[PDB]
Design a protein around this nucleic acid. Structure first.
Lengths: 106, 21, 56
RNA sequence: AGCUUUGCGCAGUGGCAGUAUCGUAGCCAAUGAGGUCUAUCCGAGGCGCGAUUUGCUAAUUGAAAACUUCCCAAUAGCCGUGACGACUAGUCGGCACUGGCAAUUUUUGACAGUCUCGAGACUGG
């Protein structure tokens, strides 16, 4: 249970953006996505001990409505040096995996 | 009886070019 | 043979060889799927006519 | 005092088909769209342009199908023997490891089956 999934969650929607250029995109994702709608949190998963970008990052959006337009207008949009691929965030943690296992037997 | 095969490593080793034992 | 002692099909034998060779295994989801399949086989092999007759 | 008709809105339960559904700060239209049976008769939309859904699950390919490896080492009862020690060549206690532990008193099985009202009987041909 990493203590790093408790910064974006304000009942907001997290878009998981994979296929990111490793050399860049430390904050260029935030620079690109700040235009819509306002200041937000956009992190990049850069593994420690190597400083090498693992690829995927996450972006937190206030509304599902703004998220729809953001996805439809940034899916494949040229960011940094690579086009980005957008999907929904999973955050399959314990409090939800227990419920999933409980539902399985039912 | 039989034992699981014990194969060596080539890529992403951080070790010497030659094999270990 | 796998550690549990089951005869290993050549395909997954080479799968394990390649994993050990490169230095990285399969994902968590694939491991879970594989294990659930193994226990499915065990449950099936370890073993509605009466119900139909009673319901008729 | 209750029954019942029409239009609309909201839900539930079914059937059918995906060559069709939708949009129209574009144009025309009951002051008439459109008429190839069918006309002193009939009577509503037409034309042009534009678009061609989302969540969940299973399965495969592959070395890897994206949500924060191996593997050494290490660690991990009794009878004899060797010392150390204690008590009178003998005895005892603890420790240690360089052989052994399925042949009547024990730890390598006289057990298993049967029958009768907690108790006994029968068989192993």
């Amino acid at each position: 249970e990493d203590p790093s999934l408790l910064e974006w969650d304000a009942d907001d929607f997290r878009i998981f953006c994979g296929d990111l250029g490793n050399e860049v995109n430390d904050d260029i994702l935030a620079r690109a996505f700040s235009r819509f709608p306002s200041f937000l949190k956009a992190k990049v998963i850069r593994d420690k001990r190597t400083g090498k970008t693992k690829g995927y990052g996450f972006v937190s959006f206030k509304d599902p409505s703004d998220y729809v337009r953001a996805m439809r207008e940034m899916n494949g949009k040229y960011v940094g040096s690579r086009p980005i691929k957008l999907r929904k965030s999973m955050w399959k943690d314990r409090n939800l995996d227990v419920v999933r296992k409980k539902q399985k037997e039912k | 009886v039989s034992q699981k095969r014990k194969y060596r490593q080539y890529m992403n080793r951080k070790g010497g070019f030659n094999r270990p034992l | 043979v796998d550690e549990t002692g089951r005869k290993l099909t050549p395909k997954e034998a080479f799968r394990q060889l390649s994993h050990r060779f490169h230095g990285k295994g399969s994902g968590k989801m694939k491991t879970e799927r594989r294990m659930k399949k193994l226990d499915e086989e065990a449950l099936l092999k370890k073993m509605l006519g009466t119900v139909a007759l009673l319901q008729e």
